[PDB]
């Protein structure tokens, strides 16, 4: 339910005389995934490609937010929050062109007016966050409204094009006259230029609040107004992992007053995530509950010139070259993100599960354990269209605060592994009987973890793990005992001192998982991912 980004397309109402659509509202169905940007400052490919193909009468240009990389079109419009202007990971904004009317008279349809999208997208969703503290994020926001016959928002967009009636009102409209976007200087209480966002993220309490405002213009008549900013919303959200969820509250309501602007309803759909190495940037959307308004935004910590905590683990281990890659993940252990697409790890509609996912180039073949693990998933991932081999593990780490102190805690589980010297043994996660078996004892007080992985004929077929715990995760080594695995008188395989890394997952460390590849050093080789659940005493 997380993602790299989302966009919402402007609506064009059908005015065909006598066939006229009274209104077109917005839905949650209308969000489109942007997919991972190659360059965040550029427009999202899929949607740009849509607007490119849109017909125009003589203005063929795609107009966009001023800080976006244009294609194509001192002075000139600014949208930024002062002191947080410089975005690396995340961008929000809009792009449109002035489209020709679309006429099908066989169906009695004409849609007129601009065509485009509001969107946000980011790269490198954060796997780490500040472990506490309150932090200011400032940024920008943008909106797109529904269309209703007779509707206008006079306080935001001057309705010479019938904005809000024939096509969506949106923050990009050329007719939107009351922001300070075009001025050369800021008043002291201005937060910046145009529509700017302000958030306070409390990483200690896992909570965020904020306000979305417009910065108003000041010249001559109207300088009587004393208020250089106007606040349309406040925000509240619960942070979990790198994602947050919450509500938006419409700030300006005198009601019973009918309104000269779109922001009226509150929202229960506020959603977003942190991007960058520390989660120093974020982007978000919400859709008002009356479906009259949709918003996207981005915000970032103060531009340049607390200890961190690890929120998740996501790893791919390539079977051939014996390499470990980090996978992006949205702090959903059930969403596998590879090659910029999201594989559902759970069914739509048993212990270990195999399926094929063909996105809409490649086809992915996925075996995933386990049915009893909610915060962690691990298994085999294979790529085809001829075939590439991998195993994966991902889990949502337990809060560093929620970690158990119990001195004896037993975890039981399974593993996938592939191991060779001269010949290959491979075996898969099973919930009995002579199948792959994983055993762990954890002394949390002592910060020590030991375990053994036993294979089919056991053991015999075995692995020994000792590690130290820090915070929400552990490191250690794995050894084959002596001498060799048996790789099945028989050939064996020799691994001493494989580096093991892992974490604790879900509330109160209900689950644990980990992995190692080998060699990483200067013989034999192995790759293993394992995961286990916390037993009762």
């Amino acid at each position: 339910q997380g993602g790299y980004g989302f966009a919402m397309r402007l609506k064009r109402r059908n005015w065909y005389p006598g066939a006229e659509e009274s209104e077109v509202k917005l839905n949650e169905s209308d969000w489109e995934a942007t997919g991972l940007p190659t360059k965040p400052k550029e427009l999202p490919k899929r949607q740009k490609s849509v607007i490119e193909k849109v017909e125009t009468d003589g203005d063929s240009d795609i107009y966009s937010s001023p800080y976006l990389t244009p294609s194509n079109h001192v002075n000139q419009p600014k949208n930024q929050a002062t002191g947080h202007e410089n975005f690396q990971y995340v961008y929000s904004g809009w792009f449109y062109k002035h489209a020709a009317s679309e006429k099908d008279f066989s169906n009695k349809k004409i849609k007129s007016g601009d065509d485009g999208y509001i969107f946000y997208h980011g790269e490198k969703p954060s796997r780490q966050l500040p472990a506490s503290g309150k932090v200011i994020y400032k940024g920008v926001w943008h909106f797109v409204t529904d269309t209703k016959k007779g509707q206008d928002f006079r306080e935001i967009i001057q309705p010479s094009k019938k904005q809000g009636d024939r096509y969506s009102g949106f923050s990009g409209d050329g007719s939107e006259e009351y922001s300070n976007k075009n001025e050369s200087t800021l008043k002291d209480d201005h937060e910046g230029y145009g529509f700017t966002s302000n958030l306070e993220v409390d990483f200690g309490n896992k909570k965020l609040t904020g306000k979305l405002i417009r910065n108003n213009a000041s010249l001559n008549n109207n300088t009587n107004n004393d208020k250089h900013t106007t606040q349309y919303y406040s925000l509240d959200a619960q942070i979990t992992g790198n994602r947050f969820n919450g509500t938006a509250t419409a700030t300006d309501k005198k009601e019973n007053e009918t309104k000269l602007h779109p922001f009226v309803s509150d929202s229960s759909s506020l959603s977003g995530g942190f991007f960058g190495p520390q989660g120093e940037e974020l982007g978000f959307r919400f859709l008002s509950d009356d479906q009259k308004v949709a918003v996207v935004g981005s915000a970032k910590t103060k531009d340049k010139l607390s200890k961190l905590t690890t929120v998740l683990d996501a790893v791919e281990l390539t079977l051939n070259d014996k390499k470990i890659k980090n996978l992006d993940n949205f702090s959903n252990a059930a969403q596998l993100v590879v090659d910029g697409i999201m594989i559902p790890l759970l069914p739509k509609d048993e212990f270990t599960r195999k399926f094929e996912h063909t996105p809409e180039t490649k086809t992915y073949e996925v075996e995933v354990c386990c049915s009893n693990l909610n915060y962690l998933k691990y298994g085999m991932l294979t790529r085809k269209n001829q075939v590439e081999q991998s195993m994966f593990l991902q889990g949502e780490r337990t809060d560093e605060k929620e970690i158990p102190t119990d001195q004896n805690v037993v975890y039981r589980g399974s593993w996938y592994g592939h191991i060779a010297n001269g010949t290959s043994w491979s075996g898969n996660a099973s919930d009995k009987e002579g199948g792959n078996r994983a055993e762990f004892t954890v002394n949390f007080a002592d910060k020590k973890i030991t375990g053994k992985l036993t294979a089919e004929n056991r053991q015999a077929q075995t692995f020994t793990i000792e590690g130290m715990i820090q915070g929400n995760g552990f490191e250690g080594t794995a050894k084959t005992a002596e001498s060799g695995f048996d790789l099945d008188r028989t050939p064996k395989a020799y691994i001493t001192d494989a580096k093991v890394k892992g974490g604790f997952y879900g509330p109160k460390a209900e689950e644990l998982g980990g992995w190692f590849a080998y060699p990483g050093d200067k013989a034999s080789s192995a790759t293993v991912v394992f995961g286990a659940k916390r037993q009762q005493p």
Partner: protein, 675 residues
């Protein structure tokens, strides 16, 4: 190294060009423009060479100018050869159709008549008249000579193939191609009309003036006009088949070096032009006739930047030649869709709604500026639009005519009731006092847009008479005058965003009457607008946040006599009277436009009560889209169908008094074709 590469079509030309090069070198300083001669096989080759940036200029006849303009050559007219005199230069000649007095037939009555042509493949003689008649010819229209032979009852078509198409030689048997044929050439054709051989002669305007022995006796003849009336022979500027440029030098449209070329040619005519030098004659050579320029050239004129090949050749010429090249005829017979020209997207959106509601009797074309739109109407690209009187003035000089007028006065007699026009007023804040018409200097100004009646022409012309000099951006400290040069001080107060700033369309919020008033409110000292603007925008009449709370009693009008009066007093305080805005078109579309608009306004006009559920042609939000928002109706002009007759002698003098200050490109181009 600034070098004009001239294109030669023959070795004789090449050697003349080299003589040209060498003689220029003796006159132009080393550092300046020089000639390079490049030789090609033919004019086509030259045109391609220029487009390929292998060369720079060449001089073409009219037909080739059109060819040069087409993709992928995209070449444009830059310099013009002129003839016959310096004080009254002939850049153009007029192809006319001359007939006898009271012979009672018009241009659309030609089928069946007897025709006299100067000769086949000649411009005025053949290509123009046959091209304009092309659709009237019976099918098959290929081959052309056969079709023509079936259209006229008989002809003299010198050079025509008489063997295959006898009736083409009927009036000059054999169709002789030399002056041995008494009917060949210009005089030949005219003598064919005079002899009573044919009913009509296709010649140029100078032909009868030259070939009449008695020279009175011109009253025995008339000219056929494209609107299917006849005018006297002297009226040819107003009655003609096409206006064609004689010899035109062309260059690339982009990166064409038009400056260098004009510097070179201008210096060349100074030293080597008519009678200027014994050493070298630009306009003759020993080697042959008409090398690089016509031997009859008296000099060169610069073609204005705004011009492009279509605009320079003119509507009628392009129509005739396109008919001939393309050959597409419409399959019918009553009024075709009127193509309305909209200003940017704001007007385009409303125009689309209009078209859907008129069920196709109206169609839509956009341009980003009024001048752009007017030019499209000249083209054929567009048919009509409504214009501020300052622009009905420009459109007039561009050959467009007024058809219906916007009436702002409320009555039940509206369409039939001519109006004297509205008032141009100078509007200031009551709070700011002691600022008077007497000195506005150094103050900050707001105009509807440059070249418009109230916002520009009236007030600036008056100011011009006071100050006797053209730079008004120096006179005012700052202002907003949309359509001004973007780096001007008159662009500084403009609210337009980024490159929209000071643009003369609705992308700039200070554009137009309301735009200007909002400028006075929010920035300026004085706004130039129509007398109705302040009452339209105060007392809550305007709902938008900026004008929502505005009160009428807070403003005053500047009187010419140096006093001030409340805005209601506008009758006794005003700068001048402004002619109502009017719809304009091409003469050929004028009947259709008059009839279609009368029907359209009976449907969507101010008789429409509820403007939400239904389309109101005369309303928009403060923006005057396609028409002034106060238009009550569109009214009959009657005899007032020319811009001069429509605007009145007084306004046309005032705008003319401002000619020296004009930044208009389109006006420059138009007055060049027709002073």
């Amino acid at each position: 190294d600034k070098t004009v590469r001239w294109c030669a079509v023959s070795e004789h030309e090449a050697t003349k060009c080299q003589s040209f090069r060498d003689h220029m070198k003796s006159v132009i300083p080393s550092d300046g423009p020089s000639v390079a001669c490049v030789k090609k096989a033919s004019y086509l080759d030259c045109i391609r060479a220029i487009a390929a940036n292998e060369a720079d200029a060449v001089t073409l006849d009219a037909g080739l100018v059109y060819d040069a303009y087409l993709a992928p050559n995209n070449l444009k007219p830059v310099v013009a050869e002129f003839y016959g005199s310096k004080e009254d230069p002939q850049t153009f000649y007029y192809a006319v159709a001359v007939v006898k007095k009271d012979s009672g037939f018009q241009m659309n009555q030609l089928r069946g008549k007897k025709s006299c042509h100067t000769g086949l493949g000649r411009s005025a003689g053949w290509n123009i008249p046959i091209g304009l008649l092309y659709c009237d010819l019976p099918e098959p229209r290929k081959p052309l000579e056969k079709a023509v032979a079936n259209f006229f009852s008989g002809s003299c078509a010198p050079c025509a193939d008489g063997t295959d198409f006898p009736q083409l030689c009927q009036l000059c048997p054999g169709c002789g191609c030399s002056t041995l044929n008494q009917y060949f050439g210009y005089s030949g054709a005219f003598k064919c009309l005079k002899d009573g051989a044919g009913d009509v002669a296709f010649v140029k305007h100078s032909t009868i003036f030259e070939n009449l022995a008695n020279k009175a006796d011109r009253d025995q003849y008339e000219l056929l006009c494209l609107d299917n009336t006849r005018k006297p022979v002297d009226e040819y500027k107003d009655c003609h088949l096409a206006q064609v440029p004689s010899h035109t030098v062309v260059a690339r449209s982009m990166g064409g070096k038009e400056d260098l070329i004009w510097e070179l040619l201008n210096q060349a005519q100074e030293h080597f032009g008519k009678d200027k030098s014994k050493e070298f004659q630009l306009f003759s050579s020993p080697h042959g006739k008409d090398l690089l320029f016509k031997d009859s050239a008296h000099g060169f004129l610069k073609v204005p930047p705004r011009m492009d090949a279509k605009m320079y050749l003119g509507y009628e010429y392009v129509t005739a030649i396109r008919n001939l090249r393309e050959g597409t005829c419409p399959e019918t017979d009553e009024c075709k869709p009127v193509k309305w020209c909209a200003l940017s997207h704001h007007e385009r959106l409303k125009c689309d709604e209009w078209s859907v509601n008129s069920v196709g009797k109206i169609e839509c074309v956009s341009a980003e500026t009024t001048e752009d739109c007017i030019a499209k109407i000249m083209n054929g690209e567009a048919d009509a639009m409504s214009l501020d009187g300052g622009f009905v003035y420009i459109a007039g000089k561009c050959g467009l005519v007024p058809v219906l007028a916007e009436n702002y006065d409320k009555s039940d007699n509206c369409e039939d009731t001519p109006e004297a026009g509205y008032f141009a007023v100078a509007v200031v804040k009551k709070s700011a006092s002691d600022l008077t018409w007497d000195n506005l200097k150094g103050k900050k100004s707001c105009h509807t847009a440059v070249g418009r009646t109230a916002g520009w022409n009236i007030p600036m012309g008056l100011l011009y008479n006071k100050i006797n000099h053209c730079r008004f951006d120096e006179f005012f400290s700052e202002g907003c005058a949309p359509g001004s040069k973007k780096d001007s001080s008159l662009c500084k107060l403009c609210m337009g965003s980024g490159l929209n700033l000071c643009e003369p369309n609705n992308k700039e919020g200070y554009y137009g009457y309301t735009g200007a008033f909002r400028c006075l409110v929010e920035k300026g000292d004085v706004a130039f607008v129509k007398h109705q603007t302040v009452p339209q925008n105060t007392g809550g009449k305007n709902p938008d946040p900026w004008a929502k709370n505005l009160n009428e009693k807070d403003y005053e009008l500047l009187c010419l006599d140096g006093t001030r009066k409340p805005v209601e007093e506008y009758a006794n305080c005003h700068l001048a009277r402004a002619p109502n805005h009017a719809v304009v078109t091409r003469k050929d579309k004028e009947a259709c436009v008059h009839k279609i608009l009368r029907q359209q306004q009976h449907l969507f006009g101010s008789d429409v009560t509820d403007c939400s559920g239904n389309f109101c042609l005369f309303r928009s939000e403060t923006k005057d889209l396609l028409f002034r928002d106060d238009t009550v109706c569109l009214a009959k002009l009657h005899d007032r169908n020319t811009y001069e007759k429509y605007l009145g002698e007084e306004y046309v003098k005032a705008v003319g008094n401002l000619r020296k200050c004009s930044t208009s490109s389109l006006l420059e181009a138009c007055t060049f074709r027709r002073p």
